[PDB]
Amino acid sequence: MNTVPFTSAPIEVTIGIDQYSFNVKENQPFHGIKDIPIGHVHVIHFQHADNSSMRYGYWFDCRMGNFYIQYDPKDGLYKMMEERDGAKFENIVHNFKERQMMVSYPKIDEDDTWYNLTEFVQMDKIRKIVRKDENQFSYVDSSMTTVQENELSDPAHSLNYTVINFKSREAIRPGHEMEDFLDKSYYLNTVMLQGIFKNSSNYFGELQFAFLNAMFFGNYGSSLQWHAMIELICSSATVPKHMLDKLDEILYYQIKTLPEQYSDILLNERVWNICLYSSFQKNSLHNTEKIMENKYPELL
Amino acid sequence: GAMNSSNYAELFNNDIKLFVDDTNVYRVTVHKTFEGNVATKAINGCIFTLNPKTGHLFLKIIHTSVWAGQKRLSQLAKWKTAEEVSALVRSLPKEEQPKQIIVTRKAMLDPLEVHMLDFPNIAIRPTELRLPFSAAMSIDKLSDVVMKATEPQMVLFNIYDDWLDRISSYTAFSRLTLLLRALKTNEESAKMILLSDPTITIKSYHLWPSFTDEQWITIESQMRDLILTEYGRKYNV
Numbered sequence A: 001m002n003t004v005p006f007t008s009a010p011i012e013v014t015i016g017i018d019q020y021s022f023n024v025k026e027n028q029p030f031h032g033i034k035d036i037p038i039g040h041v042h043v044i045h046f047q048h049a050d051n052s053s054m055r056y057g058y059w060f061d062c063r064m065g066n067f068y069i070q071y072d073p074k075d076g077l078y079k080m081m082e083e084r085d086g087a088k089f090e091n092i093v094h095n096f097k098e099r100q101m102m103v104s105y106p107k108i109d110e111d112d113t114w115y116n117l118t119e120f121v122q123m124d125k126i127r128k129i130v131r132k133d134e135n136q137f138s139y140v141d142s143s144m145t146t147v148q149e150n151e152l153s154d155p156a157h158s159l160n161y162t163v164i165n166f167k168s169r170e171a172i173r174p175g176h177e178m179e180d181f182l183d184k185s186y187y188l189n190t191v192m193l194q195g196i197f198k199n200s201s202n203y204f205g206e207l208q209f210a211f212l213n214a215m216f217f218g219n220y221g222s223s224l225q226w227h228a229m230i231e232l233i234c235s236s237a238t239v240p241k242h243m244l245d246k247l248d249e250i251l252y253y254q255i256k257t258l259p260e261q262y263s264d265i266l267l268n269e270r271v272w273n274i275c276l277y278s279s280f281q282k283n284s285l286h287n288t289e290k291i292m293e294n295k296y297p298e299l300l
Numbered sequence B: 001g002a003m004n005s006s007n008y009a010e011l012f013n014n015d016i017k018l019f020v021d022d023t024n025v026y027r028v029t030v031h032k033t034f035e036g037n038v039a040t041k042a043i044n045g046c047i048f049t050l051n052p053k054t055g056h057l058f059l060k061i062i063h064t065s066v067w068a069g070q071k072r073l074s075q076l077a078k079w080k081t082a083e084e085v086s087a088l089v090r091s092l093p094k095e096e097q098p099k100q101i102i103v104t105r106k107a108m109l110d111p112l113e114v115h116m117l118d119f120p121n122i123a124i125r126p127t128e129l130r131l132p133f134s135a136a137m138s139i140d141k142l143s144d145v146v147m148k149a150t151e152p153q154m155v156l157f158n159i160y161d162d163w164l165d166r167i168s169s170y171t172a173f174s175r176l177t178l179l180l181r182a183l184k185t186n187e188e189s190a191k192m193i194l195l196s197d198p199t200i201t202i203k204s205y206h207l208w209p210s211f212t213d214e215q216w217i218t219i220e221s222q223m224r225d226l227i228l229t230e231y232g233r234k235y236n237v
């Protein structure tokens, strides 16, 4: 179990760690988060009390280094940093653990939610979507735009998700216009899976990461990406059986975790109604269709 | 974006554009079977592709053989239309290719956009106008060439005959749409008006009768009377 210590909490802030969150008061003696489960990526995220504008945060994996959070009064945010001196960190952390100045990552033993939300998410792929190669962790916030959004303006600060566009030469073979537009299997299976992602695990990983950025930061381009990746599978007549079964599980846990009050903005009516009721895969997502109908019957 | 009453003169500027109407592409007669069920029998159709500035009509005849062994024909008809329009554009010299294509039905937008991906600079636009191009098969010479076709065929016409020698393209289009609206609302009465006089003749190379300017005023008046009436006969007013 690993630890992300904090030098201090000089400004009042709601701190999230994965799907958990807690309020820290201005200059409260808070010095970090302990008992973080090893083996998963994690996200530690922030919303200031004074400016609910800009949720922001950091994706990280404690196996890749020792990370600590420090408030920067110039840039006005909590920054993740890496401590190379493994003894400065062991001692700095032990001091804070002995003084009980840390919150415990509050996982219930039965609870597989975080695993189920991040099953295919890997730090190395996060770091290719979020390009900042001098750091081992990745900053995301509510305002960052996606590469595809930029095409339709700072490239250093973009989300480089895989561009998916159903009315594009990449998606449509000359001579198969109608066939490929109405059945996207060649785009899914040959262009994206075999060609770009290489396997379905990497596809699902980007889909899951896009959802998490939409949920935790209200990042609109990430929501667009999540829905596009769902719609590309549902609009394919030919999808490997294992992928459909895994997609059903993935979406179930995303829909289960979504705040009930954010459904209006984070869920695209057209995509979900098409995927669950019109598409080729309308009968392949039993778990997802059941939770959607019992939790958000209005949207449908 | 969409074409409506407010940007109407754009049709007669010097940017090449085509209207595409797909109404008459997939045409059927519905009939009873010996077992008393219902079946359709397709008949030849056409794509109506029209330059509104010049009158040039590219009439792609759709022979019933194109539907043999195909499913969901009303959906296929939209993609067949887009394939043929795309093939037409590719066949034209660059300087004759349209800068915009206006579809009369919004369901043609995605089929045509996908077929024209090679032409990112050609704008595909819907319209808010209720244009009467479906009545094109009420023009006897167009109907004749569609029904006689035994294979796919493109036939080129000028739907304005020689009118542009005497009137503007705005006025020619207004006359065309008036004639077609009449033919659509009451084909028999409209046709009586036009060619009920046997001493008035259509030229071999023309589609409509050779009216003098004064006879066109009378004719156009008789069509507007027909349309208003039917609009009464229809709503009782």
Ligand SMILES: COc1ccc(C#N)c([N+](=O)[O-])c1
Pocket (backbone or CB within 6 Å): A005, A006, A007, A067, A068, A069, A083, A088, A089, A092, A093
């Ligand atoms: C200036 O270096 C450091 C400052 C604060 C902390 C903390 N918390 C760490 N650490 O290793 O966790 C390093």
